[PDB]
């Protein structure tokens, strides 16, 4: 039948998860636990096993088929992703589950280390019991975020995943830490008025008491994403500053943090820094899990780069092959370059609704300073002494006098750097025609030397950690 | 030899004198039996009219297909089709190696003429595969390559030129090398890398005597346009102007020769009006360039460079007259060009100095180091991120 074919792969899924739990339980093996847990296992569990072969009715077959309700409720947790009490909360195509025929296979392998017989479910006290429970939830959450489940299922995730846990450990908190972040993205997507932020805050207190590196990193990045949606600026600003955000973090974590920090910085008139992190973020983000947030980074970033006075290329639009969705941003790119306001104001209002979703709209209005700035910027840098009159004819500014105030303000900001001599009336470039007399070639090299040294210190410590973890746990 | 066809395509691409070439272009598919194929070659021409055919319009300047062009095509495919079948039958009778590959080429030509481009490419691979000498394999690649160059579809051209070059030493197919040199230069112009074309073409003339490929004289003329565009004067000076190639031909060179003479004389009013002349006669006569915008940027930046290189100061009037291009234009181009640092200059318009920061100074060597250096940090970060987890 249909669940028999995918049965081979369920034993495979169980092999990787069971081991992962095992590792965690013996002291601090933390580094090896987080790489396994996130993009690597997940890309396989969902896509290869369930979707590709077909049969998504192997997910609540995986976390139940014994009839475990667990000593602290998690029976519901398993239902809601798939097979609510009917055939499919998305895709069924299963003739055996725990509400169709109990048992057909054991991914549970008759030992508490993912799942185990009903004897655990009704009551246990074992030290294997928290370890299976935290783990139980990671396995479930994997289909939730990929398939983009919604509704009530989304609302009840939070309850089971935290306020059943307020005591964990470092091993357990790490697993839970990953589960909360995936649910949080699924939550964000629906654009429900029911507070995403509130749960994520409650989860933070538990993260902090165990003092688990992982818990702080995951929650914090999501908490910023939540904050942007509501559009309550002050809290996110403080929260970003508090995040130390560890150097030993998963790839998806790295791309998402830089991305949030960029959104926050862009409105602020810290656009030079915002644009670098946002460009980086797109590259760093994967091909599979990342896709919802990923879209949003490329759309926002095009506006953010303009804010610095960068003129973004056509290759940028064509190459990921999203050019259609990007088409309006493309229009802003043209408008910024020309130096004339009329085209920029018109586009801002017309696409206004579409921009607001992505969270661009607050950044779009800031470009009005930038429309003129980007055009005066090319002209001031290129030439030496040029008249305000040249700037105004080319750019289509109102007056040379108008153009004179505008250049003055920019040199104060210092992203065009010049000194104006309104005698004859030219704007003058800064330039020394030798930078060897100045420290600047040395200072440039020296900065690299600090940046380089950081890589050496990071590498020596990181290198031994996974083989060490493997030694205690025993390797074949 | 089919290099003439590429010269027909090219002149309409920039919309100036298109009219006469359009007609000449149309005549070539009658001979071949290329009706369908023509629409594909037409694509390469883009940024001008090429749409009218007997199977389409008759309104625009590009020439109508004849009733005869169509009929000839019907004949040619029937005949090709007859050859293919006939060639196999002869193959059973005698040697396997030579005869069978000739048969597969018949099949590719047949599909290529009706317009089944995909079909032609699978057949063409078959040809390549079949056991014959390496020398013979090369002969089969040169036809598809020329056809590839016509459409200016990048993929086809890459494959052929690249394998063709390998074979030369290994087989010992030095005799084929002559056709191949010219073919390498065609590839080289075809990508937006005019830089490669300038070194490649100059070599091509000396090693070439003859072996089934376009005239000696034609190349020399073509060598001058690539040489100038890419090369700055000290390189240019040694190679072409002192070198043999350009002098021996003598005649048929005046547009290009006027450029070199003016550049020697170093009167920039004279050089700039000859830039324009060599752009209209020579440069537009090539279809080549997957983005034309790159070709235009390189000719302007080169001429500009020469003028700026010779002088740390010029008055604005001398510089502005010398270019002959507008205040609006000079400025508009200058902003893009300066970034590169091939020019590395700035305009003091109100005192009237055209100053040059110098592209030979410390300021330059710095601009490059910093520009490369910063991007490398971003990169160490992307690599580093994957490795930890």
């Amino acid at each position: 039948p249909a669940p028999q074919d995918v049965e081979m792969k369920e034993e495979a899924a169980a092999g990787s998860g069971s081991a992962g739990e095992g590792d965690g339980k013996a002291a601090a093996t933390e580094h090896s636990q987080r790489e396994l847990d996130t993009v690597t296992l997940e890309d396989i569990k969902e896509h290869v096993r369930q979707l590709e072969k077909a049969v998504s009715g192997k997910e609540p077959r995986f976390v139940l088929r014994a009839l475990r309700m667990l000593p602290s409720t998690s029976r519901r947790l398993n239902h809601y992703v798939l097979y609510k009490a009917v055939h499919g909360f998305f895709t069924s195509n299963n003739a055996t589950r725990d509400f169709l025929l109990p048992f057909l296979e054991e991914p549970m392998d008759t030992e508490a280390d993912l799942q185990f017989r009903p004897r655990t479910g009704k009551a246990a006290s074992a030290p294997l019991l928290p370890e299976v429970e935290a783990y139980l939830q990671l396995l479930m959450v994997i289909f939730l975020m990929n398939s983009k489940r919604y509704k009530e299922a989304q609302k009840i995730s939070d309850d089971l995943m935290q306020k059943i846990s307020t005591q964990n450990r470092r091993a357990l908190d790490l697993v839970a830490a990953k589960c909360y972040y995936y649910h949080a993205r699924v939550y964000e997507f629906l654009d429900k008025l029911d507070v995403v932020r509130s749960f994520l805050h409650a989860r933070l207190r538990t993260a902090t008491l165990r003092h688990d590196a992982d818990g702080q990193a995951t929650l914090l990045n999501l908490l910023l994403r939540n904050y942007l949606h509501y559009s309550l600026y002050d809290q996110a600003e403080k929260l970003v500053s508090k995040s130390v955000f560890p150097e030993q973090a998963n790839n998806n974590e790295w791309a998402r943090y830089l991305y949030y920090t960029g959104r926050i910085k862009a409105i602020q008139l810290e656009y030079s820094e915002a644009r670098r992190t946002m460009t980086n973020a797109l590259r760093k983000a994967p091909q599979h899990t990342a896709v919802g947030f990923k879209q949003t980074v490329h759309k926002l970033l095009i506006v953010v780069e303009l804010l610095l006075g960068e003129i973004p290329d056509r290759l940028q639009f064509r190459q990921p092959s999203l050019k259609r969705s990007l088409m309006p941003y493309f229009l802003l790119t043209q408008a910024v370059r020309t130096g004339n306001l009329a085209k920029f104001n018109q586009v801002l209002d017309q696409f206004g609704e579409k921009f607001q979703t992505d969270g661009t709209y607050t950044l779009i209005i800031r470009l009005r300073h930038n429309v003129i700035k980007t055009g005066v910027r090319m002209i001031s840098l290129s030439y030496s002494r040029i008249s305000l009159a040249d700037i105004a004819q080319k750019l289509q500014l109102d007056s040379p006098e108008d153009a004179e105030f505008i250049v003055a303000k920019a040199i104060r900001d210092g992203v065009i750097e010049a000194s104006i001599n309104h005698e004859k009336g030219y704007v003058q470039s800064k330039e020394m025609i030798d930078i060897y007399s100045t420290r600047e070639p040395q200072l440039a090299f020296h900065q690299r030397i600090s940046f380089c040294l950081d890589i050496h210190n990071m590498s020596v410590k990181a290198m031994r950690f996974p083989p060490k973890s493997y030694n205690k746990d025993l390797e074949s | 030899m089919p290099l003439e066809n590429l010269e027909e395509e090219g002149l309409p691409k920039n919309p100036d004198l298109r009219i006469a070439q359009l007609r000449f272009l149309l005549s070539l598919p009658e001979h071949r039996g290329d009706t369908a194929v023509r629409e594909e070659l037409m694509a390469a021409v883009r940024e001008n009219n090429m749409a009218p055919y007997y199977e389409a319009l008759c309104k625009s300047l590009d020439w109508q297909m004849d009733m005869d062009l169509l009929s000839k095509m019907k004949k040619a495919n029937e005949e090709e089709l007859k050859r293919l079948d006939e060639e196999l039958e002869d193959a059973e009778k005698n040697l396997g190696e030579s005869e069978i590959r000739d048969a597969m080429m018949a099949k590719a030509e047949y599909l290529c003429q009706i317009g089944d481009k995909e079909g032609a490419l699978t057949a063409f691979r078959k040809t390549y595969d079949k056991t014959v000498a390496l020398g013979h394999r090369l002969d089969i690649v040169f036809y598809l390559l020329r056809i590839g160059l016509f459409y200016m579809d990048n993929d086809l051209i890459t494959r052929n030129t690249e394998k063709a070059k390998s074979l030369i030493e290994e087989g010992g197919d030095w005799d084929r090398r002559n056709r191949l040199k010219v073919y390498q230069g065609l590839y080289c112009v075809a990508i937006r890398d005019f830089k490669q074309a300038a070194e490649l073409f100059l070599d091509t003339v000396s090693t070439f005597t003859s072996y089934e490929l376009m005239d000696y004289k034609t190349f020399v003329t073509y060598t001058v346009y690539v040489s100038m565009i890419a090369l700055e004067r000290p390189d240019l000076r040694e190679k072409v102007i002192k070198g043999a190639e350009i002098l021996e031909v003598l005649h048929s060179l005046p547009a290009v020769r006027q450029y070199l003479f003016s550049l020697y004389e170093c009167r920039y009013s004279v050089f700039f009006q000859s830039l324009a002349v060599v752009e209209q006669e020579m440069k537009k006569d090539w279809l080549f360039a997957p983005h034309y915008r790159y070709y235009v940027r390189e000719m302007r930046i080169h001429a500009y460079s020469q003028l700026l290189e010779s002088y740390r100061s010029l008055t604005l009037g001398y510089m502005a007259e010398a270019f002959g291009v507008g205040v609006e234009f000079i400025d508009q181009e200058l902003s893009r060009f300066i970034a590169a640092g091939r020019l590395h200059c700035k305009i003091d318009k109100v005192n009237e100095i055209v100053e040059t920061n110098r592209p030979d100074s410390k300021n330059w060597q710095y601009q490059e180091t910093i520009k490369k250096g910063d991007l490398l940090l971003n990169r160490v970060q992307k690599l580093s991120r994957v490795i930890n987890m």
């Binding site: - | 009013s269 324009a276 752009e279 235009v296 940027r297 507008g326 234009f329 508009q332």
Partner: peptide
């Protein structure tokens, strides 16, 4: 985005012949 130089080609050739006389 797209280079303004292309649009410049047709305009720049013609300018040259007139300009030299017009301005010194």
């Amino acid at each position: 985005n797209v280079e303004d130089d292309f649009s410049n080609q047709l305009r720049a050739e013609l300018e040259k012949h007139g300009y030299k006389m017009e301005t010194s």
